[PDB]
Amino acid sequence: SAVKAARYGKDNVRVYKVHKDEKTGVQTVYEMTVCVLLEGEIETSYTKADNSVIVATDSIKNTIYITAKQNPVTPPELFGSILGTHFIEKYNHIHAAHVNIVCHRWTRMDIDGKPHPHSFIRDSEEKRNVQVDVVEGKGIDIKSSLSGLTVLKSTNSQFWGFLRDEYTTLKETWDRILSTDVDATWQWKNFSGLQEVRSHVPKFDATWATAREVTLKTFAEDNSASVQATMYKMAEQILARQQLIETVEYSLPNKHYFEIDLSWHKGLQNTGKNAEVFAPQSDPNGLIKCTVGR
Amino acid sequence: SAVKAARYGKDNVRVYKVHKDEKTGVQTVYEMTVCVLLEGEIETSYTKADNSVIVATDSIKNTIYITAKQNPVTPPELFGSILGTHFIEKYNHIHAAHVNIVCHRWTRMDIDGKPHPHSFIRDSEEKRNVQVDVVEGKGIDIKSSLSGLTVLKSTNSQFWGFLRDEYTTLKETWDRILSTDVDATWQWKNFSGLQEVRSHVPKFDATWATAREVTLKTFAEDNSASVQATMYKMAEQILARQQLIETVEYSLPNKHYFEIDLSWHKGLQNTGKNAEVFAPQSDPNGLIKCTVGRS
Amino acid sequence: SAVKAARYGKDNVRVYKVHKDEKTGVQTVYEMTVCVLLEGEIETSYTKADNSVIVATDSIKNTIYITAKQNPVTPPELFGSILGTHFIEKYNHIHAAHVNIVCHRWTRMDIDGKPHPHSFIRDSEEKRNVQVDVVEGKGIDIKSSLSGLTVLKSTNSQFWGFLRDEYTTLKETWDRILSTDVDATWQWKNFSGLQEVRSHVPKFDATWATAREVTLKTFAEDNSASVQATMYKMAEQILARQQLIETVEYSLPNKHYFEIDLSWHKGLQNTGKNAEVFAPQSDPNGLIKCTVGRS
Amino acid sequence: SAVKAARYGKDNVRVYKVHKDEKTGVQTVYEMTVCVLLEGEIETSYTKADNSVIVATDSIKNTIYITAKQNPVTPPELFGSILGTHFIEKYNHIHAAHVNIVCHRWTRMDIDGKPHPHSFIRDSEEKRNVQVDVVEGKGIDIKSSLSGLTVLKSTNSQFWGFLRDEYTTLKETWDRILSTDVDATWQWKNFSGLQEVRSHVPKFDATWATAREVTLKTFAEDNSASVQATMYKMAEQILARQQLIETVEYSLPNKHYFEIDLSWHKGLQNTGKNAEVFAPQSDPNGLIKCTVGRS
Ligand SMILES: Nc1c([N+](=O)[O-])[nH]c(=O)[nH]c1=O
Ligand SMILES: Nc1c([N+](=O)[O-])[nH]c(=O)[nH]c1=O
Ligand SMILES: Nc1c([N+](=O)[O-])[nH]c(=O)[nH]c1=O
Ligand SMILES: Nc1c([N+](=O)[O-])[nH]c(=O)[nH]c1=O
């Protein structure tokens, strides 16, 4: 037997950084959860119990705080690159650093129509994330994403014309409720190293803010033929909106709302065009993914 | 041995209701989870295994669906009152109905700067809840609440002057991060029945909006001397603002962010005035609560 | 406006304690999550913002560890009493102490049929808990419980004879799956103080073992007319076996498993007597509660 | 732009199957959660909004139910094999079926030491799972696994000899607590089809039992030099006991238990050799993985 692959690191490293402005005095908060996983010539730590090759996971935790203190934590794509670069460079047996970051929302409150200097709110469980893979002599592979963005449309969604057979009981429909938790991932074209990345910094927040706007918009305006049809259109606009991005991935759970036939009760009309009260279903759920390249 | 207390019903009934405007075409969604426990002359289903006094939890479910269909579902205070009342009246062996509604946010999307007709977003895990207790001959007791409201302030919070002894190790501070999850409940004056409740409908949505606002506002403005202090303030304004509330209750789990001393690394300064990077703590957590009533 | 009530303390305090036997060499681990909520003359911390009367929540955290260090942490009923007692005795303005304890399972592994000396496994998400209320001159109130004990029986459960009306669609059944999460609580007779508690220490683990025992058996053996009937039975046995317990509370979720009519597909028989494959429902769920006391 | 990848299906499909033995009487439950994503000539549904290619996820759900009702459901590798197969065959345009199955523990209850015929307990949150990719013309690929296995050992674990530098502050140790959640996956060599799988059936349940046993025992015995070192040993014995296993993957979150210095209080000694009370840490946590194939 033999170590085909190995990675080890620290997970769930929760970090919080505050930016205090002098003139304005206005503070900015950033909170994230980090996980670094290392790779390289370390087999011996598994095979023969050699801890000499092991950089302690506590050390990595130490490193993460240290870095966040010396560098800017935003945007996640940068910070994750600065982070993952360090590891491969400060150590010789360390060839690949895998950085996952999850940004949490700390929106600035508006008290009395005016933005507040130092009071924030978790205005959603939606996260902004980066998977940054830093390889020695292969540059930095970034994958940005947005997740947990939960949406719902009360109509203007349809589902018919699907294959029918001896396992089909679903009835075609022209007016259904459409709900999902959006998971969108846009991969960036390989970066030489940190230098290329810093050069594109502004492109990151803009591409995330774009992907978000497209998703929302396209969700709401598309007279959905299917979830499939709606993702591709979503993808499309993103690609077309950014040359750097190489691909776009969407994984969407089709969260079902079922009509309730109340007709057994005083001939109550609650189906079809009379549908008012539905039963959201926790499960099962539809899952539909798809990667969109050029 | 004897049945000292009993209640049964149905929990986690997910309900979704759509309202369509024929004119504008603007649809409006509502989603809640409902729990109805019923109390009554039911000892016999426990002691003699007598199911004839039982109204199947299934039927309670159906009832919830029908009631949502034939009635307005907002404000939750109203719906809950209609729903609980039905059971005490429909059934003679049932004398109390306990109703719990958790309202889920489905805020309308803002596409291109314009409120979309039929598109919403879950803009927060925050919830609006109501606990309606309906007792035959004792009116309707309503507690209204907001929960899941997570806040954080990077400064303007202190904690010094607390009792020190041989169990203390907590260094006083004049500046600290203050984050918490807000659980605030306001309890309305007992209501005689559905009628008096309908009489005050507009008040509910308003009082809730007030309570929220009063909570963010105070939290953000107050130069906190202690979570206990900031809290009381919030309660105060709430009572002063609504005559109908008999009591306000706040439950605050203060979530700690610890500074990380990095002096051991190239003398890096990261505490006190030079504190930038902190480490949020999942546990433990302080837990402060209090009930403010009227004089 | 006035502070009708206030409590505060520390929540979610994880504690782990090991017991190393010199002779045997065998080790015994204990893990739990603790919460202490304090009460007393502490309004001025809310009203006048006076941190003088505030024992810092952090100091409560310290106190927990310290206490856990000088005393045994098992049984929880005792540990909780010692800890609650301390606070009321150590502080004059502190009159009531509320202590909650959730004990996690770390069951000793059996390797090769023998009980390993220092290797444990979490063999259930089942908890054993205690809510101990220590009040100045009112004694110690102890509520012992188990929770998160998930069970199922594929037959020997029925539900029929229930009330049927225009809201009823549930078909009577003489055979169904029954699955619930057991939440069971037994309230001990009040205790003067720490001494009386220490005197009954052997009764605790005993009574919890019994409660667990009686719950499992009765759930397995009973041909269930209703979940209510079965739960009342199980409370009875518990009150009989232990005189110190004044009341027993059960709260059970009736997790439904639905039949799947597959007839529409090649006349496949899956319902009634032919039922093999079912659809466990995440929700909603029946919720049946009941507190059984002494006649 | 174009469609580089696309999969679609049904997720979280709860299934429960009962087996009734007419002779003995002994009933036997199985409960699982299936997810089935399909791949094939379906690009059009995304680009040309043509649902003619789409086999409604609902039908997948129905398919799953029927399938479970017409076949045996254990061992998961068989069922998921039958199930993924069915979709490639029945549908020309579908050329890959990815089937996930999570098996839920329903362990037979022991009432008065005698195994009950129809009663069960979720004796753990441990899960047996299988991932079964079935590609048309590339046999059946089957990764087996066990997850949610939570263990802890009070001693016989050390960690010293690691690299130290200006980032290090971790003290070496010759005795520490080791606790993790074991995630162990063992891949099977590619199988030609449903007939080869069916062939080996008996291997499945047995390998799984071995993987647990190897895991359990090794963890409990190995005087651990590093998590890394103890894992590798496990992988070894697994690959050894089964020539059908192409690789073994272990994912182990190292859950930390910190010492609590209490010297500040009456010089209480709670560190090193006198460490009794510890603070379990929810986060962060070391995460150690590694795949072990053959030479
Ligand atoms: N960093 C590591 C630790 N550690 O505690 O940091 N323990 C291990 O078994 N392995 C590691 O790599
Ligand atoms: N509603 C009830 C049901 N039921 O299924 O609706 N089953 C019981 O055992 N008890 C109930 O009260
Ligand atoms: N212990 C307390 C803290 N604290 O941080 O320990 N903060 C508060 O606002 N109040 C307390 O009582
Ligand atoms: N099965 C599908 C459904 N459906 O509801 O079953 N809806 C979609 O948009 N897409 C599907 O593939």
Side-chain angles (χ1 to χ4, degrees), chain A, chain B, chain C, chain D residues 1-21 24-113 115-295:
Chain A
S1 49
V3 182
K4 287 206 73 167
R7 306 149 108 78
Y8 85 86
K10 201 65 123 164
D11 201 357
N12 299 289
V13 181
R14 293 182 71 190
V15 212
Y16 159 105
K17 179 140 133 183
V18 49
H19 183 296
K20 280 142 184 300
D21 184 358
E22 300 300 79
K23 40 153 345 224
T24 46
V26 144
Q27 319 200 347
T28 293
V29 310
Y30 304 74
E31 188 175 331
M32 55 197 102
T33 295
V34 184
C35 150
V36 177
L37 279 206
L38 309 179
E39 243 171 342
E41 331 189 25
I42 48 152
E43 298 55 79
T44 32
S45 49
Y46 291 103
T47 72
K48 355 189 104 253
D50 177 9
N51 291 351
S52 64
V53 274
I54 298 150
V55 183
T57 74
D58 193 77
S59 289
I60 288 141
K61 165 180 84 159
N62 285 319
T63 304
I64 292 158
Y65 291 149
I66 274 141
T67 303
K69 173 48 172 196
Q70 325 197 289
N71 307 215
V73 311
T74 181
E77 295 88 357
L78 181 59
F79 177 74
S81 312
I82 282 157
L83 201 15
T85 279
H86 160 112
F87 288 105
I88 46 136
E89 278 173 19
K90 182 67 144 223
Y91 307 90
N92 303 313
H93 54 331
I94 292 325
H95 303 309
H98 306 285
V99 190
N100 199 118
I101 302 193
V102 170
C103 283
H104 301 103
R105 305 171 55 112
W106 271 135
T107 274
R108 178 172 317 267
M109 318 210 221
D110 280 334
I111 299 224
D112 278 342
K114 335 150 258 159
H116 196 284
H118 60 256
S119 273
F120 309 67
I121 208 167
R122 160 84 25 101
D123 77 291
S124 158
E125 230 47 54
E126 179 203 336
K127 313 294 192 202
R128 182 186 161 175
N129 339 117
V130 314
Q131 192 167 106
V132 159
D133 299 318
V134 179
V135 171
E136 225 178 50
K138 292 234 177 194
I140 307 163
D141 284 330
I142 313 214
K143 261 146 104 167
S144 296
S145 81
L146 81 85
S147 75
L149 160 80
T150 303
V151 293
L152 177 140
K153 75 179 340 209
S154 58
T155 191
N156 232 37
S157 156
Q158 302 146 104
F159 189 69
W160 49 263
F162 43 91
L163 179 168
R164 309 199 57 108
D165 68 353
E166 82 267 30
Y167 296 104
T168 304
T169 71
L170 178 78
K171 289 185 170 170
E172 318 190 23
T173 165
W174 287 266
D175 200 10
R176 76 178 177 174
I177 274 171
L178 178 77
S179 192
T180 183
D181 304 308
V182 183
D183 213 295
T185 308
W186 51 115
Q187 193 159 260
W188 292 89
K189 79 129 191 180
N190 184 295
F191 285 115
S192 37
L194 249 148
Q195 236 4 254
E196 197 174 356
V197 178
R198 303 179 159 284
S199 92
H200 290 130
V201 159
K203 269 181 207 83
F204 300 132
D205 279 17
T207 306
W208 158 88
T210 259
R212 184 154 182 291
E213 163 204 292
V214 142
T215 302
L216 260 16
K217 236 205 117 123
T218 299
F219 183 73
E221 302 182 341
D222 192 46
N223 188 247
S224 171
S226 76
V227 158
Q228 285 79 153
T230 308
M231 289 154 54
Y232 187 94
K233 303 162 127 142
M234 241 154 209
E236 271 214 324
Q237 314 185 44
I238 261 125
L239 285 178
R241 282 263 242 309
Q242 168 65 231
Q243 223 37 55
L244 265 25
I245 297 350
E246 254 179 64
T247 81
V248 157
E249 203 181 346
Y250 270 93
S251 181
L252 298 194
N254 185 11
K255 292 187 155 185
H256 326 289
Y257 287 54
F258 277 6
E259 321 195 300
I260 308 142
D261 192 10
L262 296 177
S263 89
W264 56 270
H265 181 80
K266 304 184 165 139
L268 219 24
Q269 281 337 281
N270 192 49
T271 74
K273 234 88 69 198
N274 298 109
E276 285 183 288
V277 166
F278 294 80
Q281 311 292 305
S282 307
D283 56 45
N285 69 272
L287 191 42
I288 283 119
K289 330 181 160 257
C290 116
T291 322
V292 188
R294 325 137 164 311
Chain B
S1 78
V3 162
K4 274 261 313 227
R7 285 140 92 107
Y8 79 95
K10 203 103 205 177
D11 204 0
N12 302 289
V13 185
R14 313 190 49 194
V15 175
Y16 161 104
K17 167 143 168 249
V18 77
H19 168 267
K20 321 210 192 187
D21 183 331
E22 306 284 309
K23 290 308 307 222
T24 96
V26 169
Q27 312 186 96
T28 291
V29 288
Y30 303 106
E31 201 183 306
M32 54 200 101
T33 298
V34 182
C35 152
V36 182
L37 310 185
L38 293 186
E39 247 187 318
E41 308 187 40
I42 71 220
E43 306 65 55
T44 48
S45 64
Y46 290 92
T47 76
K48 319 282 165 104
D50 176 35
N51 293 354
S52 51
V53 266
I54 278 161
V55 160
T57 65
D58 193 69
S59 313
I60 308 192
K61 174 182 63 174
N62 291 344
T63 300
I64 284 166
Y65 287 138
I66 282 137
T67 307
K69 167 68 150 190
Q70 299 165 353
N71 292 274
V73 290
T74 154
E77 288 87 352
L78 186 47
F79 183 59
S81 308
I82 290 175
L83 188 43
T85 287
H86 163 93
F87 295 98
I88 67 189
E89 300 193 353
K90 179 102 246 251
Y91 314 84
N92 321 295
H93 66 306
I94 270 90
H95 325 290
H98 312 286
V99 166
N100 182 102
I101 309 181
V102 166
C103 271
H104 301 108
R105 306 177 52 137
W106 269 139
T107 282
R108 187 186 304 284
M109 260 171 218
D110 278 341
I111 301 278
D112 295 343
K114 335 165 259 174
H116 202 286
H118 58 270
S119 276
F120 319 73
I121 185 152
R122 171 64 55 79
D123 73 321
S124 184
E125 233 21 74
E126 191 184 310
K127 318 270 157 194
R128 162 147 183 215
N129 324 111
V130 329
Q131 188 194 118
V132 175
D133 283 298
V134 173
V135 197
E136 204 161 32
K138 317 195 112 351
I140 303 157
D141 289 288
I142 299 176
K143 283 151 117 41
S144 291
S145 41
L146 75 69
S147 53
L149 180 58
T150 309
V151 296
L152 186 150
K153 71 177 2 189
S154 25
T155 207
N156 254 67
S157 168
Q158 333 139 46
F159 190 67
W160 56 267
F162 53 85
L163 177 174
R164 313 202 67 98
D165 72 310
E166 75 265 29
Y167 290 98
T168 308
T169 60
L170 179 72
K171 268 161 211 143
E172 296 188 77
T173 183
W174 271 277
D175 200 43
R176 96 200 161 148
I177 287 150
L178 182 84
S179 180
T180 182
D181 284 335
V182 183
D183 216 273
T185 302
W186 46 105
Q187 156 146 262
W188 300 82
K189 177 256 350 201
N190 181 264
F191 293 106
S192 71
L194 246 195
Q195 281 300 92
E196 201 184 349
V197 193
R198 308 237 197 207
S199 122
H200 297 288
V201 178
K203 268 174 223 78
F204 299 136
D205 289 343
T207 327
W208 167 82
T210 288
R212 211 177 170 281
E213 184 205 310
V214 179
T215 296
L216 294 293
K217 178 142 205 162
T218 313
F219 183 76
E221 278 166 5
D222 208 58
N223 203 304
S224 146
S226 188
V227 131
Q228 288 69 329
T230 306
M231 257 170 66
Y232 184 95
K233 278 178 175 116
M234 292 163 180
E236 247 188 333
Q237 323 188 17
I238 315 277
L239 290 182
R241 246 133 129 6
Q242 168 60 234
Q243 225 30 66
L244 258 351
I245 306 293
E246 284 213 292
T247 177
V248 165
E249 196 200 328
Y250 265 93
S251 176
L252 301 191
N254 106 289
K255 327 166 103 200
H256 320 292
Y257 288 67
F258 285 6
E259 321 174 314
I260 315 216
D261 169 61
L262 298 152
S263 88
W264 62 277
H265 179 88
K266 318 194 165 131
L268 230 12
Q269 290 314 277
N270 194 47
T271 71
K273 212 90 69 188
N274 296 30
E276 281 196 298
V277 180
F278 285 93
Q281 306 277 310
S282 306
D283 43 74
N285 64 273
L287 172 59
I288 303 116
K289 46 175 50 216
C290 88
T291 307
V292 181
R294 349 164 124 311
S295 312
Chain C
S1 64
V3 172
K4 297 227 34 181
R7 23 147 94 32
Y8 83 98
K10 207 61 160 186
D11 199 351
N12 294 299
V13 185
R14 318 188 48 189
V15 182
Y16 160 102
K17 180 152 192 220
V18 56
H19 184 292
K20 300 171 171 237
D21 193 317
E22 283 324 69
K23 224 262 144 310
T24 53
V26 166
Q27 305 195 78
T28 307
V29 320
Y30 299 102
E31 210 202 285
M32 58 180 98
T33 304
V34 185
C35 144
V36 212
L37 277 220
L38 302 174
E39 246 182 334
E41 325 165 4
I42 54 174
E43 299 73 46
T44 61
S45 50
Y46 287 98
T47 52
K48 328 214 144 271
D50 159 39
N51 296 349
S52 88
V53 296
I54 288 307
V55 174
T57 63
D58 197 76
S59 310
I60 290 134
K61 155 176 111 173
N62 289 321
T63 315
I64 291 174
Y65 294 145
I66 307 294
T67 304
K69 170 57 136 155
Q70 308 169 348
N71 307 273
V73 291
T74 187
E77 294 90 342
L78 171 61
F79 180 71
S81 313
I82 288 164
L83 183 43
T85 285
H86 161 110
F87 290 99
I88 81 178
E89 285 178 352
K90 184 72 196 207
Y91 305 87
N92 293 313
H93 55 320
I94 290 309
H95 317 305
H98 313 282
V99 172
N100 201 98
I101 312 181
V102 170
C103 280
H104 302 107
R105 288 165 66 107
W106 273 132
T107 283
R108 184 183 309 281
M109 243 132 100
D110 265 327
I111 275 199
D112 292 320
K114 323 166 264 207
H116 197 289
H118 61 274
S119 274
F120 314 73
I121 183 183
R122 159 86 35 88
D123 76 302
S124 181
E125 223 45 58
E126 194 199 314
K127 302 319 165 168
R128 154 178 189 176
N129 337 98
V130 315
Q131 232 314 100
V132 149
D133 292 315
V134 185
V135 197
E136 208 135 61
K138 290 241 195 194
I140 312 161
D141 270 308
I142 304 180
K143 249 143 95 105
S144 295
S145 84
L146 58 76
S147 86
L149 171 64
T150 302
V151 297
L152 174 144
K153 68 195 308 200
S154 58
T155 210
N156 258 44
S157 177
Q158 344 170 339
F159 194 55
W160 52 262
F162 43 91
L163 191 153
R164 314 199 45 102
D165 66 345
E166 81 255 33
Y167 292 101
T168 312
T169 69
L170 175 71
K171 281 174 120 171
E172 312 216 328
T173 195
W174 288 272
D175 194 64
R176 69 180 185 169
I177 312 215
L178 179 67
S179 187
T180 172
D181 290 319
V182 177
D183 200 312
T185 297
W186 52 99
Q187 162 156 259
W188 296 89
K189 156 196 93 105
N190 167 292
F191 286 124
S192 28
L194 234 175
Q195 217 201 129
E196 181 162 16
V197 191
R198 299 187 167 279
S199 91
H200 297 137
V201 170
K203 281 176 216 52
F204 303 125
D205 283 345
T207 302
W208 157 88
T210 287
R212 203 188 169 276
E213 221 204 64
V214 170
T215 278
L216 266 346
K217 220 191 142 139
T218 312
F219 171 87
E221 299 169 18
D222 197 345
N223 207 309
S224 164
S226 48
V227 149
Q228 293 85 165
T230 300
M231 75 187 322
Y232 176 93
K233 272 160 185 148
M234 64 196 43
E236 233 183 7
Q237 287 152 86
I238 303 188
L239 272 192
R241 300 237 221 311
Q242 185 51 253
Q243 240 53 34
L244 253 346
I245 271 86
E246 272 169 6
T247 84
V248 166
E249 203 176 322
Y250 271 97
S251 158
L252 310 173
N254 171 23
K255 331 185 119 190
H256 331 284
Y257 282 67
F258 283 2
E259 272 181 355
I260 305 115
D261 183 314
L262 281 172
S263 96
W264 60 271
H265 178 90
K266 297 162 196 184
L268 217 12
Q269 296 313 288
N270 191 51
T271 98
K273 201 91 115 148
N274 281 103
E276 283 195 277
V277 171
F278 297 76
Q281 308 310 288
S282 303
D283 41 86
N285 60 273
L287 171 50
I288 314 133
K289 314 185 153 272
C290 139
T291 309
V292 180
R294 274 155 196 314
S295 165
Chain D
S1 22
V3 158
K4 296 254 324 227
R7 289 145 98 87
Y8 87 83
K10 204 51 125 155
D11 201 2
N12 301 302
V13 177
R14 320 190 44 204
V15 186
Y16 155 111
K17 230 242 211 120
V18 63
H19 170 274
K20 286 141 140 210
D21 193 76
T24 66
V26 144
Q27 281 179 309
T28 286
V29 310
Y30 307 101
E31 199 178 322
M32 61 195 79
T33 299
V34 232
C35 156
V36 164
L37 302 205
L38 298 185
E39 273 190 310
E41 312 192 88
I42 55 136
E43 292 72 36
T44 24
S45 18
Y46 297 83
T47 63
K48 281 144 182 4
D50 160 63
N51 318 335
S52 56
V53 301
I54 282 10
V55 160
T57 71
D58 191 79
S59 313
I60 293 183
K61 163 193 80 140
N62 285 332
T63 308
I64 302 184
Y65 288 134
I66 286 126
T67 321
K69 159 70 147 184
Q70 282 158 1
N71 301 240
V73 290
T74 181
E77 299 90 332
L78 174 36
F79 184 81
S81 294
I82 277 139
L83 192 74
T85 289
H86 161 102
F87 292 94
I88 32 168
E89 293 187 350
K90 173 88 198 159
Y91 308 84
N92 311 305
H93 73 314
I94 294 308
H95 314 299
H98 311 293
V99 173
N100 198 88
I101 301 182
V102 166
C103 277
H104 301 113
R105 294 178 61 115
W106 272 126
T107 280
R108 188 166 320 258
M109 262 194 212
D110 259 3
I111 306 305
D112 300 321
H116 202 280
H118 57 263
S119 281
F120 314 76
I121 208 165
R122 163 90 36 110
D123 69 314
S124 183
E125 208 54 45
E126 204 194 295
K127 308 284 161 214
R128 167 153 174 203
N129 332 99
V130 315
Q131 211 169 82
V132 182
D133 308 272
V134 181
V135 199
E136 200 167 31
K138 306 299 243 216
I140 315 171
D141 286 292
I142 308 171
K143 273 139 138 104
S144 290
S145 40
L146 60 66
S147 46
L149 182 45
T150 309
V151 285
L152 172 144
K153 76 189 319 206
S154 11
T155 189
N156 278 28
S157 173
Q158 2 193 299
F159 187 57
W160 55 270
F162 47 92
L163 182 171
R164 328 191 54 99
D165 58 23
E166 71 281 36
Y167 291 104
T168 318
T169 67
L170 174 76
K171 297 161 167 192
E172 307 190 278
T173 188
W174 275 264
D175 201 355
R176 73 184 185 156
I177 300 172
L178 193 65
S179 169
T180 171
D181 294 332
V182 171
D183 233 86
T185 293
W186 50 111
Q187 174 128 218
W188 295 88
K189 145 226 69 104
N190 169 267
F191 296 65
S192 47
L194 231 197
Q195 271 111 86
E196 195 176 6
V197 164
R198 257 156 206 306
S199 97
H200 306 95
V201 147
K203 316 216 166 326
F204 298 142
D205 272 359
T207 316
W208 171 69
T210 289
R212 217 186 169 258
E213 180 204 304
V214 150
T215 291
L216 255 8
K217 185 145 164 188
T218 307
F219 176 80
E221 291 169 0
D222 189 69
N223 200 309
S224 185
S226 46
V227 183
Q228 290 80 158
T230 310
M231 274 166 110
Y232 185 94
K233 295 195 160 115
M234 277 157 173
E236 255 195 312
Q237 318 197 44
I238 291 314
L239 290 136
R241 296 247 242 309
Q242 173 58 249
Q243 204 75 80
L244 249 352
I245 305 321
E246 288 210 34
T247 73
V248 163
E249 175 170 352
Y250 264 94
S251 192
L252 295 210
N254 179 24
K255 311 173 113 166
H256 323 302
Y257 284 72
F258 291 171
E259 285 182 344
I260 303 161
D261 187 340
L262 290 168
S263 72
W264 63 271
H265 183 89
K266 316 203 182 156
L268 244 54
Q269 290 170 288
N270 191 49
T271 64
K273 224 145 113 228
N274 320 90
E276 288 179 284
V277 178
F278 287 88
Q281 302 286 324
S282 302
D283 53 72
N285 60 270
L287 172 54
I288 283 88
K289 16 166 103 236
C290 91
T291 318
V292 158
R294 317 138 156 320
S295 311

